[PDB]
Design a protein around this ligand. Sequence first.
Ligand SMILES: N[C@@H](CCC(=O)N[C@@H](CS)C(=O)NCC(=O)O)C(=O)O
Ligand SMILES: N[C@@H](CCC(=O)N[C@@H](CS)C(=O)NCC(=O)O)C(=O)O
Lengths: 217, 217
Amino acid sequence: PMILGYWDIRGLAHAIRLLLEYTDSSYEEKKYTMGDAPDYDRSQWLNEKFKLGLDFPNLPYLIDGAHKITQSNAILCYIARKHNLCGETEEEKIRVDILENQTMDNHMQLGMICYNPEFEKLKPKYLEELPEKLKLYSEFLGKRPWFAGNKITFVDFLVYDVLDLHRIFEPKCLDAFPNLKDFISRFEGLEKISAYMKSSRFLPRPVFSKMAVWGNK
Amino acid sequence: PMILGYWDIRGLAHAIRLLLEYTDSSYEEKKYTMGDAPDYDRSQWLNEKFKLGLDFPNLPYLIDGAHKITQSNAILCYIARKHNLCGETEEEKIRVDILENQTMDNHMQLGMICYNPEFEKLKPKYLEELPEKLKLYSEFLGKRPWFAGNKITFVDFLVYDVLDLHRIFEPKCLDAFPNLKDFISRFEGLEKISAYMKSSRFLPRPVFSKMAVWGNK
Ligand SMILES: N[C@@H](CCC(=O)N[C@@H](CS)C(=O)NCC(=O)O)C(=O)O
Ligand SMILES: N[C@@H](CCC(=O)N[C@@H](CS)C(=O)NCC(=O)O)C(=O)O
């Protein structure tokens, strides 16, 4: 079957796993475990990294027969394309593109400070600027059920992950934005998502790798 | 007319300008100038940032009537969609997605060290790992005229920029990869690209902003 390869954590594979579940995809997971400190041994992956037929060897990767895909966003698009979750109208597509790139940006910013050895010192400013970021997603969604419009697309999975990672980081961060909380309920309320979250497959944490200062476990 | 807003440099607007020229698009450019050190005044942009109707205020941005778009890759997709430069077959689309994200990754890596105050110290390792990166693009392209296959797509503009930024950074870096050099000749050899590169509009540098340690001018 289709196979998703990634570290034995949540990370960049989260939205992918969620999408694979929602779309009722047939897949397996090749999990790689990173060694503990001080080495943080990555040989489980490196000893196989160049033996998978990947053009740009990376994690996560998705193998679907002849198709070997890397780059998290690329994997999401590939799956989304099979289930018409890419956006149909021009307005939807524009929203999808912006979010696809916007979410990764916001994701990176969280990861940047969390892996930074000086995490505790940088945290105050990040939390200071966080409401501003969240408000943008809030205003962008508006009264829409989903981010691209009235139908769900793959970017909802990406935004869900960004919003979720933040409620975990700062529990009260979504309180000022009721529509964002409702988005989360509506998403988690999806039949196939609800079922997956209650299963043994669900892996909401560790958020980041063992090398992280926050969310490393 | 359509308007592209960005700093008065090359940066993330390069592939966009090139695409706009190749597609024969009607556009203007709102250039923002950053102040010199030590302040690096960004008020020319900030004083207008939230007055443009952008959902996630950022640079570059593209205003096309009712459409206000941010995120460089989103802008490229928007323009590409109008001129059937997104990829048609499934294999082309997969290549486009991987490259769209891959190029940004490699682009970020260059920018990370170039803006880093310790640029000179980090440079040795980056140059050591550079051949590896370039070889991946080389093998990926193979004997294809363009990166997605036989027809040109918007990712060729992104790969061109990544390759070009590196020949500027390390002149001999593409020597070991003849097909990459041929790709550059073929791209620059495009009639509308050739014409633009010879015009007053062409802005190949500064590569990065004034805050950069390398390519700041
Ligand atoms: N932009 C890539 C990032 C991939 C990446 O950075 N993967 C990390 C884990 S978060 C990794 O361990 N890659 C394998 C390697 O470095 O060889 C994506 O979205 O997939
Ligand atoms: N991933 C984004 C990055 C956007 C970004 O970082 N833009 C910088 C310049 S390289 C900027 O000055 N943005 C305006 C701002 O921060 O207010 C893209 O590709 O457009």
